[PDB]
Amino acid sequence: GKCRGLRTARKLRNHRREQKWHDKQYKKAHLGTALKANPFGGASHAKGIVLEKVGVEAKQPNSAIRKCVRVQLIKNGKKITAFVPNDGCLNFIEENDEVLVAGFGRKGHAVGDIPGVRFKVVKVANVSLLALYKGKKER
């Protein structure tokens, strides 16, 4: 059990500090890993250049083709697979364009039936993808 001694503040402080590393949520934010492997490097959004136009298939029991894009970031040159959210917005995307990608819902976790996509496109050609979908800023 616990040591309730009046001079056990050192034993309690050392035990609690060590057991916090067995927490998955704590060891992820207080280590070099999970941040060096993070392509964004701890940022909210990121800009990149579109390399290809790949379509990943949704996992079971779903059946569809997710319109994704192979993007290479600028600040570190890493290759990520963003997601073009809305309907037909992949046509607004052209290869070798400047797109502002961001996270996808869950932090560093694949959202929905998409196999390994954990990012999504926010802007393209320095204009927002949402305005292109609503008939504004025709680009």
Partner 1 sequence: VRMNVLADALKSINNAEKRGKRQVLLRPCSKVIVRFLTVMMKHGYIGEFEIIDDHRAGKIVVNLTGRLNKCGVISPRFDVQLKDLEKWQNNLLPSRQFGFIVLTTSAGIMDHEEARRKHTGGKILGFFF
Residues 53 to 72 in contact with RNA, rule: CB under 7 A: 57-67
Q: Does 6 bind partner 1 (CB under 8 A)?
A: yes
Q: List binders of RNA among 79-98 (CB under 7 A).
A: 85-88, 90
Shortest Å distance, C-beta 7 to partner 1: 10
Which residues from 71-90 bind partner 1, rule CB under 8 A? none
Q: Nearest approach, Cβ of 103 to partner 1 (angstroms)?
A: 42
Question: What ranges make up the beta strands (E) of 1-139?
Answer: 45-52, 55-57, 65-73, 79-83, 98-103, 119-124, 127-128
Least gap, CB of 134 to RNA (angstroms)? 8
Whole-number Å distance between alpha carbons of 113 and 117: 10
| Interstrand relation of 45-52 and 127-128 (parallel, antiparallel or unpaired) | unpaired
Q: Compute, in degrees rounded to 10, the torsion defined by CA atoms 79, 100, 75, 50.
A: 40
Q: Which residues bind partner 1 (CB under 8 A)?
A: 4-6
